[PDB]
Symmetry: C3
Subunit: 224 residues, 3 copies
């Protein structure tokens, strides 16, 4: 009955709880970036735009690669408003209280685990969407799933540009961080499962690859 558990696991509604956790962890990372708090005070619109890149960069990059509107996902009003609320609470909550609660390590690890659930689903969805337009476009499936999982990291040079920062000597392709490298392995696995060359159900691969990401990310977050 393991496949029955995997089917329920791979079909959990990511909206709104799992998307919120994704938004919280991502906007938390934004606040850690140099000058982010100063930017929220002096340039609140650019600060919000930065947070939307962190929350939705996966869809912005996938749509760009597939020639679709890069802000197509912003037609999802409930998601945009929910991410906007997370940005506001993290940067402007009185007593900084929301930050204090979601930074509590037991609470933060849970949100980190829930974000990985969303990232794996995102990779698989990117592969399947590209496949729908290109039945044998293996390289297009791999590219789309990769940017769906990496998110804002693959546009980090230009996320920095928006913030008034320019560091051209490195980029996430030249030197991949773990989530970028892991999303590349993930997109190959999901593309191989799409090819029917990897003899495993789509629900089992989602389950096992998410558990891999959850263990890695929770361990990396608890260590530092």
């Amino acid at each position: 009955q393991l496949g029955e558990l995997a089917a329920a696991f791979a079909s959990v509604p990511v909206f709104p709880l799992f998307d919120a956790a994704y938004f919280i962890v991502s906007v938390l990372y934004l606040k850690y970036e140099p000058g982010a708090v100063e930017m929220s005070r002096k340039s609140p619109f650019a600060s919000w735009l930065c947070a939307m890149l962190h929350c939705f960069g996966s869809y912005i990059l996938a749509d760009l690669l597939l020639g679709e509107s890069p802000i197509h996902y912003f037609s999802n009003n409930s998601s945009v408003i929910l991410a906007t609320a997370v940005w506001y609470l993290i940067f402007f909550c009185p007593m900084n209280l929301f930050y204090k609660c979601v930074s509590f390590l037991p609470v933060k690890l849970i949100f980190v685990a829930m974000k990985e659930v969303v990232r794996v689903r995102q990779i698989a969805a990117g592969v399947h969407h590209a496949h729908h337009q290109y039945h044998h476009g293996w390289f297009i499936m791999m590219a789309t799933g990769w940017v769906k999982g990496s998110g804002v990291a693959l546009m980090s040079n230009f996320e920095q540009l928006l913030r008034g920062v320019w560091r051209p000597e490195t980029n996430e392709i030249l030197h991949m961080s773990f989530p970028t490298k892991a999303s590349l392995y993930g997109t190959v696995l999901f593309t191989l499962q799409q090819t029917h060359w990897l003899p495993v159900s789509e629900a089992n691969l989602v389950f096992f690859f998410t558990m891999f990401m959850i263990v890695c990310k929770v361990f990396m977050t608890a260590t530092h």
Copy 2:
């Protein structure tokens, strides 16, 4: 009969006179930029391309956001040729005569007023076009109208790159100039009018918001 006046005002043919005024003021601003005259002499093709960004950047950015060909508007041969003539006359007219005439303050203020007529129509058109593709895409309507009104300012970092200039420490989002900020207020107003939450006719909002832009821009141009 104020609505009868507003209907005639909001439906005046922008081509070719009002578009020409837009092109003149924009290419004048280009000539004010550092190295612009030198660039027209040594790199005349890049100089013309820069002028096309100033004249058509509104359509280039809107089409990019909506996933349409970024040079789609360049199929409008008469408009492209008219902007090309304005660029040539401003940079290469014997005796610099065309520049002298259009820089005459009474003449320049009129062209500045006529450009604002075109900008407001552009914002409204961006909102209505996004709405046609996304009936409830409020954030897509706001983004499209914003870039239609801001024009080349929102791509200023890359207009500078084309010119051989790189100033990453600032951008029009991080620090909005008045036309960028005003186009953001404008696009919210036109989106609210699209939502039917703002109880005002589309022709009246065009009239009153254009008069607001005309007074502000004429006053700002005459002061300096």
Copy 3:
């Protein structure tokens, strides 16, 4: 019977031999770039991506200008794999043997000539494709044919960014190299032939303009 020869010349199958020659010459140029060998060792994925830009940048830029998926051409699995093989053999062949063979001047000049065959066909194809979407879009035809022939040169600033290099003081538009300038002349000629204002068959223009590019490029390669 010159038109009978020109028809056979303009319809030769570019895949796979003529495309391979294009890939070889382009990836050779990549290896000449500063830090390229070091990058292939430390960042092999970015190195491969750079080589794909050199091999396919024509299609990436044309698709971008026309609002189509920028990686649409990567659905051509055989072409992508063939370019990947060329990249691997040039950077990782034991004894560097593949490099030694294709760098042999008599062999290199032939590959240089065959690449020009592919470039001219690319320019003409860009013009005809834009024409199909815009029957009278002269400026769109010219832009599309231009980027099809110039290839990665028009994205050189961002090919450098991928490599960790940033040199904003120059770009291929501000200062055109010979292949960029020649592709601009070529796209005007093919657009004029599309307009029916240039009284010459499409096969004759391909033949004569390719011979022009072959003589120029072979002479430029043999001189230095």
